Design a protein around this ligand. Structure first.
Ligand SMILES: [Zn+2]
Ligand SMILES: [Zn+2]
Lengths: 373, 373
């Protein structure tokens, strides 16, 4: 396999289905990436993650650099070897979690210094250091390091952060390119910024395309603007990106967000929702989410979802999982997480098949009618 | 298969190896039973429990009667169906955990009333109610309900509690026998009491043999007396029990306790040690236990144990598991528990093979020399 090759097999409107070929494997798109925070997809062995249908997982650079440490992971043979996942891994840049989780952050044009939320140890991130950490982890898809824009944001602030992000995108590009092993074996994605402003989104897309990346994320969404606004921004933003590269919507999300984003040209997604909310009792079904902790499930012998092909739904009842979650049992988290990630992968498979067959519009309508009945 | 058939295939001194055949499966002895507290062996799917080599698991009646409830489990089809383990299950009587975990306990010749440690709801146990709850769960090996003797105990108190336990053993026998489905499909074990006193142990053995049970536990040990004393009591106590039935040492335990107890005629064991201590970082190895949290393991690429055949030791390093446990990750508990239970099953297999081959004395010596080096 090549370092990176994205091929589009079929289209319907703005929606696309295809494959990304990389050295460690093929990624079917549209793709959902389970999130591995600190070198584990929570409560699942890698073989179970694979069995659900995942082609690629995400690793969080911020968490990994704090624990167990990037240099340590490199010494031990890289993230794939460390955690036992041999397929592609996309790593985020670490920048967002610096903003959301760390303290004492000092920002500058050079990068950011911050104190760990774990022990108050001091750390630094910059375009160069983020790219280096992702190299040490042995990431297959490396994300450019950017500066996030909060919601809401004034036009001036959105412009300033977008402009800094574009300068940092060029720095990320050059850092990546200057490291032979990384440049020859991994891919680099840029991140479009500009908040909800069309002109800024256009300037950002232009800057990123001029630099040139293997893929393009739409950043700065799913941060409080709500679905209508997110979709409005996607409507004009995605067409600005190069058509022939993957489009990645960061930080989303809910099944309906995924379907609508695919309708608008997005190819890749990640979110903690199926893992995190699973551990909290939320199970996805084709008739909408349920909270398994609810008393109504205490004697319900049906599986979590009536159609789901996952191993959990073949073997255990709602009643049993209700008990496990209410009791705080680890097996509860294991079963909920496996089911939710399997559900997400089945959603992506239905999306891919429907686009391939030219019936994705009908699928989206049918999906919504039932999910929100 | 029959309701119950214990066959001894080989002996060496007081040690025995053989099989218990029951309707749901065959149990190889000496046997280690992983503990399922609230209808789950913590952090493991039943298929993983089976893959380690377990033939039978233990369920805790006290916990199950509180959550999710015995009647509820019966309504849902019984414990095997509920949790997805189709092989034999031994249930304890609930009495010990009433003493150790519950509050506001009122004891009488009839039984005990107590408040749940979970929500202060009021509950009752008696020989009759314990046997009934074990029936509702669908237990394969039912334990007689007894009255525990603390350590240390005066001769008078030890005698009184032993005598009550024997009266309760007869009540347990009659309750079990009066329920056709239970009598025809399950087995009933009696529990020898008498603290550290030879005459009381003899009286207890005599009473239990007169009533007649399918198996005999040595109760009242591993409660603070220490290994030397426990072994001293086993030395005279086990020969008092019927030779042709299984002998079960409750609440133990450490690998060296198991080996010495087998040397003294014990056939069955359970303990939370491999599961509980695993989640806390303790991993068993042939060179003794280690605590995986220790800094010395942070960059150790070796598996938990150099010889262990378990899936964990085939795939992941000490360094990775060290990270998971220190990070509080669920996968850490999963991997530690699988390894520890697999280690215990490999210990039992080595014990069975060595007795079968007439070299168990040598095995015990070699095991100790290395484990305590
Ligand atoms: Zn499922
Ligand atoms: Zn192992």
């Amino acid at each position: 396999r090549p370092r990176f090759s994205f091929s589009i097999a079929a289209r319907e409107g703005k929606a696309r289905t295809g494959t990304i070929e990389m050295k460690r494997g093929v990624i079917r798109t549209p793709a959902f990436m389970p999130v591995g925070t600190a070198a584990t997809v929570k409560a699942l062995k890698p073989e179970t993650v694979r069995a659900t249908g995942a082609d690629i997982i995400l690793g969080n650079t911020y968490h990994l650099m704090l624990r167990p440490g990037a240099e340590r992971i490199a010494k031990l043979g890289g993230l794939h070897s460390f955690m036992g996942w041999d397929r592609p891994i996309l790593t985020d840049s670490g920048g967002y979690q610096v903003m959301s989780l760390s303290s004492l952050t000092k920002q500058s044009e050079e990068g950011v210094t911050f104190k760990s939320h774990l022990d108050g140890s001091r750390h630094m991130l910059s375009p160069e250091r983020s790219i280096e950490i992702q190299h040490l982890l042995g990431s297959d898809i490396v994300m450019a390091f950017d500066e996030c824009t909060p919601y809401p944001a004034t036009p001036s602030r959105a412009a300033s952060s977008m402009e800094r992000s574009m300068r940092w995108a060029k720095r990320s590009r050059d850092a990546f390119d200057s490291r032979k092993e990384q440049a020859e074996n991994a891919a680099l994605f840029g991140i479009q910024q500009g908040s909800v402003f069309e002109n800024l989104r256009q300037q950002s897309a232009d800057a990123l395309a001029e630099i040139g990346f293997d893929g393009y994320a739409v950043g700065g969404l799913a941060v409080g603007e709500g679905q209508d606004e997110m979709f409005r921004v996607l409507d004009f933003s995605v067409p600005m990106l190069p058509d022939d590269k993957p489009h990645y919507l960061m930080g989303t999300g809910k099944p309906d967000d995924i379907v609508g984003a695919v309708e608008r040209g997005i190819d890749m997604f990640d979110c903690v929702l199926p893992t995190r909310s699973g551990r909290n009792g939320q199970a996805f079904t084709w008739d909408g989410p349920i909270n398994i902790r609810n008393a109504r499930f205490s004697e319900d012998l049906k599986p979590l979802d009536s159609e789901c092909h996952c191993a959990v739904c073949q073997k255990w009842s709602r009643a049993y999982i209700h008990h496990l979650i209410r009791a705080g049992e680890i097996l509860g988290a294991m079963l909920m997480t496996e089911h939710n990630i399997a559900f997400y992968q089945q959603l992506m498979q239905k999306i891919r098949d429907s686009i391939s067959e030219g019936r994705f519009s009908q699928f989206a309508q049918d999906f919504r009618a039932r999910y929100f009945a």
